[model samples]
Target: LTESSTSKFVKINEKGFSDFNIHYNEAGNGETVIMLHGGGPGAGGWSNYYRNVGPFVDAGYRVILKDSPGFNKSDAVVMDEQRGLVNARAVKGLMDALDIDRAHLVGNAMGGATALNFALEYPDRIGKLILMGPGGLGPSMFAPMPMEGIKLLFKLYAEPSYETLKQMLQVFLYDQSLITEELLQGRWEAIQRQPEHLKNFLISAQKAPLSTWDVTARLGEIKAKTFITWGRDDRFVPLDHGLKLLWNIDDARLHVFSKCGQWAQWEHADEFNRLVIDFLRHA
Candidate 1:
């Protein structure tokens, strides 16, 4: 009934998960549509979803924007082979806390992978799946990715400076001009909010690192209707990966935004929201 941002938290059991705090925001009211954010030094639910959440609310669908573990207000994940799977369960935990049964799942970047994992592992709990510039479909996806996002991500991790952080945040957009002082300040605070924020991303590099998340072989097992949205100019995950999902997943479709980079949902919010709303409404 109202279009406003509501930040709330749900406690999850990752006692082993290093205090994974489920920091999420909700808006609108209708069939539930949860949005999962991308990964980065400054990436948070709000930071990644601010552009699209409002439109989603106006369309009369309840929107949930959650900061995936290890980003923003959420705790650092305890890396493991099942880290991706565990994250899905954490999402379910959030839903359970609110008494939600089944809802739509919208994920961006690594969040795309997390959403896919959730749909596969808990099919009954998800009504639809929307993936935006998702990562980790296969090793080849990121192997050659000039992912300015990843490159700049590590750079920011090594040296936390506004100069370096701005460049990192800018890489996510197709319109470099979108990188304004307000935008820069927003992400700067998100990254600096938690000292362990960026370091958590490097968990894979640790000596006792967990196995990397992979769902390449399971794409065929996805039964939930899926929409794969990607930036034609995506410098991170390959555009082909999005194309491949159309063929691999049981029920799938794709939309590619030209002149756009890794974050299509942000770069093309209007079209992106329309695509999502239509996709969910029809199916």
Candidate 2:
């Protein structure tokens, strides 16, 4: 199947069933795959993983990437809590608008948490779930220290200086050189687009009830086939959290990449894409 170059908008009402707008990228033609970008505090679909969407499309999946509420190109109220479930509902609402009955969900970081929550709450809407360095598993698996560090790190990230951005990106990966000028510039643009985005991010991080909701007890509640990918050298969430997830989710499979960091999908795109394609094809 040929990859389609297209983009469009969909509106949803998640929190209050109030209308919100979302921008999405659509490509290829096959099984529907909904790609949720990592929460940017102010992130959107394009900024999070535009680089890798083509591969999934080329593999013959209908790839859909959406800008979550309160993020880039999306019009929605920025609530301080239940960000994950609200995002999931917005996604489901988008599916309803688009006439999609079911989809496979792929997410990273905060997006991962949203994917898992969707599977837990609305398993019928999902076919399979793939998470990359997902959060909201529990407080004990990974400490809140990384988020605290990110709070301090964002001060530097907000400055929009190449040096500052490079330093901040380094904290996310095992390799510092991966912080290319283009990557830094892209992140800088996204950050600059919303001046108070970092504050939103901090609020979502701190206030989201997921921090207290233990997925450990509800892992078995997730009926969809789940797959988790983590960077063995991740400095942010750590590899141990993946292990805990492996133990909790009954059908969950864990894949660990070496010498990679929290942003494993971008840092190791080839391997990441290969693993994902293989899993979805055979799982």
Candidate 3:
């Protein structure tokens, strides 16, 4: 465990079936709340969404921020085509490592899909689920950018000049100005630490088929209390994904924030945290 200037962060080195390194940040203590980040060429738990975990932890939940295999400080390796399967297994492994029998699973984008998959495959392990901008809803969940476009994205991370970095930040939110110089520099430094890491990460992220599209057909099979949230103007994954999830999951409530983009939590952290805290507390 290490203490940052503002918050206490812990790194758990756990071995999964693939023998990859899993790093997590833990704070507070009560019901466990496990958080997952989106799929970024440079994504990780901390980088993608650390702004909201502290509030949940302060609300008396054991908050966990997970670093998926190749991102952040976790072990770097080429993940298999079944990245979602590996992610689910890693979540299970994290639970086992932490001695948490069950937890409230919360995820955004790729993490959201992983959370839904975990709930479906191991329903007994999830107490409640909160998914935001999750993938695998349908063909519509995808944004059809050209392979050339994706390659350009990889180039940005590979050799992040200031111009490339600016372009990369614009993809994250509707408000480009939110991409502060410090945030961009921090992310660029992290990406630089693992050259070609973005290329390999995007290889797995872009090619992996949506696990939830078919799984959505089996939404009735999942028994966990589910809540779905989305940004009305989400650019990466359409708001329709949340609508589909709302229709499929039994009694699932959907909340849409206007004027927000793909990064809802970061784009509207205070309101987002309030909604999550209220739902988890009263639901």
Candidate 4:
């Protein structure tokens, strides 16, 4: 964890005339695999992908966990209508600064949306994609609008507290027992460290909005082989969304973990890491 925050920073040209300082943690030496984190309060790259980084490094792959802009240690840029597109550009900016031409992207929820948008804008820069409970599928077919978990998440943002964090985690993970006091304390501390992050997120919600972030029709345009993973009990984004991803992408496959929730990377870290390695290895 100390290494993640060890004063690492890179300036990315996320916009045409704008550049932002992006924070990232890098390890190992091989084909790069960038992990993009979900958009939970206090969520960042290391916090999201810490469970899977060791195995990837040991498997002869360089792993990079980037804190998306406005989250974690990255520059807090206000999001506009472009939304994830800005983050996608920031990713490309990181690659350019690091001289990494192409690498596989592993994204969860918000991160997934960034990966998809990146593939859309810069198809040549993506090797393959692993999307876990990624967003951008539009509204759910059966689940209520906003979904149960999303509502709670919004509530947490409005009124941050240990109790709210615990409630959100209850829906985040299928196994309620997994929500420990330590986890709550850690996340709460993260939130406390970045009060402005939550404020900017709310402002972004109003400016860019999630409703306009959908890319269902553009899914067919993606060129890289994609592996979409989801939890069967994902209350935040719903499993049906992953099914839609499976149906739409050209060379895509879907994997579902039963009794799991939104954070499949954490809930089923071992199996998820193995599958990701296999997917990236497949020719």
Error of 1 at 117 (Å): 0.7
The residue pairs found clashing in candidate 4 are: none
Quote each prediction's TM-score.
0.90, 0.88, 0.86, 0.96
- Compared with the true structure, the alpha-carbon lDDT of candidate 2 equals 0.73
TM-score result, candidate 4: 0.96
Order of the predicted models by TM-score, top scorer first: 4, 1, 2, 3
lDDT of 4 by residue, 237-275 (tens): 978888898889999899999989999999999999889
Give the number of the best model, judged by TM-score: 4
lDDT of 3 by residue, 1-283 (tens): 2324223223343344544567777777899988898765667776666788778878999888888767777767666555655677778877876689999988987788789878987888998898998866666535563222234555675566767766756765777789898888877777777766676765665566444234667788877888888887776677777878888888689999887777788999999899988988888
RMSD of 4: 1.5
Better of 1 and 4 by TM-score: 4
Q: After superposition, how far is residue 205 of candidate 1 from its true place, in Å?
A: 4.7
The predicted structure with the larger lDDT, 3 or 4, is: 4
lDDT tens readout by residue for model 1, 66-105 = 8777778776764555456666878887787788899899
Model 4 local distance difference test score: 0.86
Give the residue spans of candidate 2 off by over 4 A.
1-5, 141-149, 152-164, 203-210
- Compare candidates 2 and 3 on TM-score and give the better one: 2
Candidate 2 at 4: error in angstroms?
12
Alpha-carbon lDDT, every model:
0.77, 0.73, 0.73, 0.86
